[PDB]
Design a protein around this ligand. Sequence first.
Ligand code: HEM
Ligand code: HEM
Ligand SMILES: Cc1cc(N)nc(CCc2cc(CC[C@H]3CCCN3C)cc(F)c2F)c1
Ligand SMILES: Cc1cc(N)nc(CCc2cc(CC[C@H]3CCCN3C)cc(F)c2F)c1
Ligand SMILES: C[C@H](O)[C@H](O)[C@H]1CNc2nc(N)[nH]c(=O)c2N1
Ligand SMILES: C[C@H](O)[C@H](O)[C@H]1CNc2nc(N)[nH]c(=O)c2N1
Ligand SMILES: [Zn+2]
Lengths: 416, 414
Amino acid sequence: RFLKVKNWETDVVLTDTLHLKSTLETGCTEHICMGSIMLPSQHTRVRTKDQLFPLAKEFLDQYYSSIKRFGSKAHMDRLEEVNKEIESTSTYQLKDTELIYGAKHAWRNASRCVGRIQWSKLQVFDARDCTTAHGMFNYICNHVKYATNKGNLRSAITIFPQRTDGKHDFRVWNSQLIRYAGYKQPDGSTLGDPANVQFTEICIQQGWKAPRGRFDVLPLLLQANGNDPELFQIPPELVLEVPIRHPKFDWFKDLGLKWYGLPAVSNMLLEIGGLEFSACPFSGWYMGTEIGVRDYCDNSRYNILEEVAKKMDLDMRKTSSLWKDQALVEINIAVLYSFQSDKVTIVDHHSATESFIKHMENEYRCRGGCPADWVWIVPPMSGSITPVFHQEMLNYRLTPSFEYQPDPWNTHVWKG
Amino acid sequence: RFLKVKNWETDVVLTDTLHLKSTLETGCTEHICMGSIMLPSQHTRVRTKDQLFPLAKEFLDQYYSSIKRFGSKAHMDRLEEVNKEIESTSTYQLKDTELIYGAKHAWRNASRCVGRIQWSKLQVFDARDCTTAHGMFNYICNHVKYATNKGNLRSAITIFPQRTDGKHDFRVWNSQLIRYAGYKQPDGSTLGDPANVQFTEICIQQGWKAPRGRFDVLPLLLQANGNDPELFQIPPELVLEVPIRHPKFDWFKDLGLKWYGLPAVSNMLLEIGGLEFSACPFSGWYMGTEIGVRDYCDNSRYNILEEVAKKMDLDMRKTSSLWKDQALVEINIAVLYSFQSDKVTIVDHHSATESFIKHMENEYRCRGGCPADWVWIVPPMSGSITPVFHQEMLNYRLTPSFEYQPDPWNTHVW
Ligand code: HEM
Ligand code: HEM
Ligand SMILES: Cc1cc(N)nc(CCc2cc(CC[C@H]3CCCN3C)cc(F)c2F)c1
Ligand SMILES: Cc1cc(N)nc(CCc2cc(CC[C@H]3CCCN3C)cc(F)c2F)c1
Ligand SMILES: C[C@H](O)[C@H](O)[C@H]1CNc2nc(N)[nH]c(=O)c2N1
Ligand SMILES: C[C@H](O)[C@H](O)[C@H]1CNc2nc(N)[nH]c(=O)c2N1
Ligand SMILES: [Zn+2]
């Protein structure tokens, strides 16, 4: 059965056959669409030998198809070798090749990621020999340094050992490798990034000495082999930051804003052939609106719209002056200007959405489809003047995949 | 099965039980979300005697529930009376009360409509006695004049006779009562409104004399009882228009832009209790972005962005200057400024989306939920600085409903 999607701006129609290879569930039914549910139970992540070999077999079938070896003796022996290793040890180990393929395809399958044109150029760092939080710190430092590359960012992922009985997990307790602290003041106001208050408090409790600034880079909190997590300061010379200035407004620098250059998601779960990699930091480079629109302007984040609008001297009385929209654009121009001026890799939302359309069309032709979450692909500003707004998209889940998982501080059994 | 929706800007969580009353289908499955498909086969639309009575019962049941007379004599009496009429006539007729309720609730159930906080204040015009396109024209002029109200816009719907055997359909061939013409130029491009080029052809191609200007109000093309449709020009004094100027850029007025005040959708099908009202033009008032973002700036529409950015002397060399975004805001500032200045009702996207959150709150409290289509509720600019962006919404199809229907010219046994 075939399915068509139409671009209502260009009338291009594309036929999805890839959705037939969909295993996991969306969250929707014939009678309810959960398309805007943020983290439905299906996107979040204790797995026995019973269901594991089918998951292994399908991954390996995919893998050997991509390398044009489906049904080869190499393919059959690997299936055999995996089968016996599962029944003998209740799990199995991916070869290096399989790990690299898995990690790339997980990104390729990330239906919410507008950045996927880049999916084949992923630097995969195998940290499966890691055993301690200190060893995790070292792997993450090398990741950050390689990825940052003095501003010329390179996509990378570092893969720590897979889950076994779920009692010995490797977890990075930070949502992202580099994030600013947030402090709840007694007067109710927040200093720093309000999204990080809960995490900041954990770090402080774990012994972090907080400078209590507006842009304190948080320490790494690292759990190895299911042990209690341990604090580590990322070396400051490894955290590349960009002071934010505006190309026409000289008063903008005096807002004291900066942001880090390396977006690196560290709290997601990488699933490859039934194996669960609970610690798999990955990184790329920023789309400008992630900082300019969400980080700075969300009411529940730094929320500088008011101050920026005040300094532009906009009509802030009625909303219908669109003072909020006017300031948002200027803040986002500044983010882009500052990164480009400092030669830190960044993409504006127009370029990124156009690229994703090309990627998506290419994927329908070479792959039979491209799963895409419209709710997430459309940028959080100027949506309809980017070409993804007008693009019908089919959302379905392929594996390998990145899944959410509960924050470890809610599931961890503390040792002491 | 008793579902929760979370707002991520406020942590407010609502429990939806209304979705359990859902009847029609979404187009999604457990394996695939079609939440971004414009027109799945369900949202588009003869009824047999067996299908019609359950549809009527369900509608009448909710109707008599809403008037606190469920399980009453009048309820059972009406139930049997409609039951008798179906068995006899293979259809039935709504009492005016049920018609008004049906219309208001088709709006209330429109999961893609952000303006539904107003749903109960709908002015329903019963046009079921209409028999001719001239008659249809008269009802539509009365609708337009009532709805416009000298710029103090009022919601209205006018309901023409229901479908019978699909051979006697009433249809308004226009997609909106008021739309600008679109003509393809000999030199390649498109003059006026490119969305309307085929229809603008069918008008000329059926007798219209086109001014071939850039903002020509299209004529009405009215089809009664399945006959060939007829051309009628809306009296210009009924078409309230706003010249678009900017409160900072005096050159803005020289762009020659204007828009009409009355958004009046005329091509949808209104379904009440299994009955199909194929001609049911309805109208309210604009959210600013509908004109400024979509009408003026879509590349498949008036696409004035490049011209406006030029006049602002923005750096259009690279997309990273965000000149498109900068101009988009200015254009939308101007639309709001103009409508407000001329005292024509308009809501900005910040005001309308806040209203819709309040409406959601109201519906979850007093009804148990509110079906909503995030892909359509989120404005086409500044999405995340509006509250609806961070609002989880459940989308499901309730009836009475507005549905899409095939364009008449594809269908009309000419
Ligand atoms: C290289 C440049 C990249 C850009 C510009 C980019 C952009 C984005 C953006 C804007 C989002 C929306 C999420 C949000 O707004 O919070 C997203 C989501 C996502 N990205 Fe990418 N990304 C990039 C690289 C990567 C890489 C290297 C990976 C993994 C290997 C990745 C995996 C994902 C995933 C899994 C999501 C889903 C988030 C979720 O489900 O919550 N991205 N990306
Ligand atoms: C009173 C002010 C109103 C406002 C501000 C408003 C706003 C909107 C907007 C912005 C959309 C998105 C569609 C698009 O972008 O083209 C929409 C859709 C819709 N509106 Fe409302 N609307 C209003 C009144 C009404 C009324 C009076 C009705 C009928 C009684 C109605 C029924 C609908 C329906 C059915 C849709 C979606 C059509 C579909 O399913 O694709 N609206 N509205
Ligand atoms: C590699 C990379 C490049 C890039 N340009 N941007 C990113 C960040 C995108 C992103 C964001 C989130 C959580 C945000 C959600 C979770 C709950 C609250 N927030 C709304 C998870 C992800 F996996 C992810 F990729 C990553
Ligand atoms: C009464 C009213 C008030 C108001 N502020 N705006 C409107 C117009 C919005 C609208 C648009 C459409 C279809 C347009 C679709 C079809 C394919 C291309 N377009 C995406 C149907 C509707 F029912 C509708 F209301 C009406
Ligand atoms: C493909 C996609 O469904 C299409 O562009 C939709 C997206 N959301 C929309 N939302 C509104 N309000 N109006 C629209 O026309 C659209 N178009
Ligand atoms: C409720 C809604 O799903 C939620 O706010 C989503 C919507 N789309 C998004 N899209 C992106 N890129 N990032 C986000 O955080 C969100 N949040
Ligand atoms: Zn869905």
